[PDB]
Amino acid sequence: NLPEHWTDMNHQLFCMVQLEPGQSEYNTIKDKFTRTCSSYAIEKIERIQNAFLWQSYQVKKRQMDIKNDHKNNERLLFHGTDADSVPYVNQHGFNRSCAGKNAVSYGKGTYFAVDASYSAKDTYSKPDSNGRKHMYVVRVLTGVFTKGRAGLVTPPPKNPHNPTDLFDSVTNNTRSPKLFVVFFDNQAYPEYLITFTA
Amino acid sequence: LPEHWTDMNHQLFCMVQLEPGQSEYNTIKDKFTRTCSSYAIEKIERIQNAFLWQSYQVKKRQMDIKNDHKNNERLLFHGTDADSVPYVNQHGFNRSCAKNAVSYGKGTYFAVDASYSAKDTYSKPDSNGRKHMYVVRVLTGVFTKGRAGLVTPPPKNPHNPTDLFDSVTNNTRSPKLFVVFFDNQAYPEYLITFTA
Numbered sequence: 202n203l204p205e206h207w208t209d210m211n212h213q214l215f216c217m218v219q220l221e222p223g224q225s226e227y228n229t230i231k232d233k234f235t236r237t238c239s240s241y242a243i244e245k246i247e248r249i250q251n252a253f254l255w256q257s258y259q260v261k262k263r264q265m266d267i268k269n270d271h272k273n274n275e276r277l278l279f280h281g282t283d284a285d286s287v288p289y290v291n292q293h294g295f296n297r298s299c300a301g302k303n304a305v306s307y308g309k310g311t312y313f314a315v316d317a318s319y320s321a322k323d324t325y326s327k328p329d330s331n332g333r334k335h336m337y338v339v340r341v342l343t344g345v346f347t348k349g350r351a352g353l354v355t356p357p358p359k360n361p362h363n364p365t366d367l368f369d370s371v372t373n374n375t376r377s378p379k380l381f382v383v384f385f386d387n388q389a390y391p392e393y394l395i396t397f398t399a
Numbered sequence: 400l401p402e403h404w405t406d407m408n409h410q411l412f413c414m415v416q417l418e419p420g421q422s423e424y425n426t427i428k429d430k431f432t433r434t435c436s437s438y439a440i441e442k443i444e445r446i447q448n449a450f451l452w453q454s455y456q457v458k459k460r461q462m463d464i465k466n467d468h469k470n471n472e473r474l475l476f477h478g479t480d481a482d483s484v485p486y487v488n489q490h491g492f493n494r495s496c497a498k499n500a501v502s503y504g505k506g507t508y509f510a511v512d513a514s515y516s517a518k519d520t521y522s523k524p525d526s527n528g529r530k531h532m533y534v535v536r537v538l539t540g541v542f543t544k545g546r547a548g549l550v551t552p553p554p555k556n557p558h559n560p561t562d563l564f565d566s567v568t569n570n571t572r573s574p575k576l577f578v579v580f581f582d583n584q585a586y587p588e589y590l591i592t593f594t595a
């Protein structure tokens with residue numbers, strides 16, 4: 202299942218691949234980022250090759266493509282975090298149990314932003330001892346979503362009389378989504394780690 | 400999708416009531432009655448949930464590789480209230496649903512013995528006195544003693560903080576309970592409806 206443009210990992214389960222500026226792969230991410238963070242400068246963009254996380258994500262993706270039929274279930278979103286979390290996220294991905302309370306809470310889950318500018322805030326992408334900030338670029342199974350609310354520990358039901366048939370995620374605003382919250386393991390794949398500085 | 404499953408007519412979710420006196424029913428019944436012979440079984444249902452099964456088996460193949468042996472699975476019991484059954488059947492075990500103690504961490508708790516899950520704190524009687532307990536395939540893998548406030552199992556060596564145990568327990572020499580902290584580390588295989 203592992204994508205054919207990945208570096209061969211020598212039967213190994215994980216590695217970070219440093220991208221070259223000039224590559225379309227680095228340049229599209231750099232544009233995605235700079236679209237809203239042109240004040241910051243990119244140190245490097247690493248491709249995250251996590252075999253196990255990839256398989257789990259892809260199983261969850263196929264399931265949601267079957268459940269929802271003809272939907273764009275997948276968005277490419279940003280996640281700022283501190284240096285001390287990068288090793289865990291790289292290995293194990295996004296754990297809602299670890300999530301910070303967001304300044305505007307639309308539920309108890311893992312938050313993803315549309316705009317790099319939002320993830321670029323010191324409150325998420327916290328500067329390390331050397332001034333380095335860290336932002337993931339994340340494939341997120343947003344699926345069918347609704348405006349969330351602070352109490353949510355799972356997405357709400359589409360229909361109150363069928364409690365178990367859930368939305369896939371929640372947003373801050375369904376007509377102009379700037380945030381998405383995700384409540385399940387293996388619903389986000391951390392694809393790139395952007396290291397940047399002022 | 401396993402051999403003993405029955406036809407679902409191209410559907411991905413079915414609860415299938417077992418036939419008393421047949422082999423599968425007799426196997427699940429005995430594991431319960433080992434410690435719960437004073438109770439009364441009203442029925443045993445096989446949970447056929449293709450998606451949960453797939454996600455579970457994926458985690459199982461990852462844990463067999465990572466642990467370089469095939470010893471990662473145990474059959475354990477989960478007692479729950481009637482209002483949680485529809486959720487568990489369709490979505491499995493969610494650590495975020497959280498009622499009872501979390502002494503060995505903030506995951507989902509499973510018992511070695513049915514008698515443990517058979518307590519009313521866990522398998523809460525409804526109006527009619529009906530109690531509910533899952534027989535659950537759990538990926539216990541390599542385990543350690545748990546403690547309060549864990550959000551994941553501990554690291555196997557603090558030098559490598561991301562190489563984690565698969566589960567925690569109350570007692571490593573003779574465990575009576577296991578806590579798992581990740582979605583798809585438990586597949587609910589049977590639902591036993593019974594009374595005191």
Ligand SMILES: O=c1[nH]c2sccc2c2ccccc12
Nearest residue numbers: 477478499508509510516521
């Ligand atoms: O069977 C159990 N169900 C539930 S629900 C919250 C905790 C527990 C639990 C804890 C230890 C052993 C079994 C169970």
